[PDB]
């Protein structure tokens, strides 16, 4: 498995930070305060691919913590799940962990491989949880930029 280290910023320039053990929040940060931002370990895993659609897994750099999509109270939900530190990452990652990384401009969208047309999204408001949104366009933000830190 090949990985790259990177940070993500939504299109409103909000940064992503850990709120608790299992949640990420998005907030407007600038300055030394940016040390707070989560560093992701993006892995290129097995799955269907295209020029513009690439399967990935998002773990937290150096933590056996991955972004996962599960049904919770009957609706697709994003969560941080802990994994056996010795078995991960893998090349053939379980479906709940896979996102389709879609390039559209200098922007990126992350679609659940498990739940078609469900995307990693942020709210327009400050300090709200990052979640899985079943809708594109309307109010919630579904596009991001990536910064390499050391892949």
Report the CATH number that the domain containing residue 142 is assigned in CATH: 2.80.10.50
Resolution in Å, one decimal place: 2.1
Question: Helix count (H) and strand count (E) of the chain?
Answer: 0, 13
C-alpha distance from residue 3 to each of 6, 57, 58, 138, 140 (Å): 10, 9, 9, 32, 28
Torsion of CA 80, 9, 28, 39, to 10 degrees: 50
Distances (CA, A) of 40 to 59, 61, 128, 146: 6, 5, 19, 10
Nearest alpha carbon to residue 43 among 53, 57, 55, 60: 57
Rounded Cα gap, residues 116 and 138, in angstroms: 18
Parent domain of 92: 1-151
d(CA 1, CA 90): 6
**Which approach determined this entry?**
X-ray
Sign of CA dihedral 105, 110, 113, 116: negative
**DSSP secondary structure string for all residues of 4-63:** EEEEEEETT--EEEESSSS-EEEE---GGGGGGS--EEEEE-SS---SSEEEEEEEETTE
Q: What are phi and psi of 18, to 5 degrees?
A: -75, 130
Three-state SS for 97? helix
Contact yes or no for 147/16 (Cβ under 8 A)? no
Around 12, how many Cα atoms within 13 Å sit in the side-chain half-sphere?
Answer: 16
H-state helical runs in 31-147: none
Task: Say if residues 120 and 132 touch (Cβ distance below 8 Å).
Answer: yes
Give the chain's largest Cα–Cα span. 41
Cβ atoms of residues 109 and 116 within 8 Å: no
Q: Is 64 helix (H, G, I), strand (E, B) or coil?
A: strand
45, 61 in Cβ contact below 8 A? no
Return the DSSP state at 73: T
76 three-state secondary structure: strand
Structurally, the chain folds into a number of domains equal to 1
Tokens matching residue 51: 């020029």
């Amino acid at each position: 498995v090949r990985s790259l280290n990177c940070t993500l910023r939504d299109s409103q320039q909000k940064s992503l930070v850990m709120s608790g053990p299992y949640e990420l929040k998005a907030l407007h940060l600038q300055g030394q305060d940016m040390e707070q931002q989560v560093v992701f370990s993006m892995s290129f895993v097995q799955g269907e691919e295209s020029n513009d659609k690439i399967p990935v897994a998002l773990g937290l750099k150096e933590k056996n913590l991955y972004l996962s999509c599960v049904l919770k109270d009957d609706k697709p939900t994003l969560q941080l799940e802990s994994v056996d530190p010795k078995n991960y990452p893998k090349k053939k990652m379980e479906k709940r962990f896979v996102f389709n990384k879609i390039e559209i401009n200098n922007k990126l969208e992350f679609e659940s491989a498990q739940f078609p047309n469900w995307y990693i999204s942020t709210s327009q408001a400050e300090n709200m949880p990052v979640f899985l949104g079943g809708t594109k366009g309307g109010q919630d933000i579904t596009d991001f930029t990536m910064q390499f830190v050391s892949s």
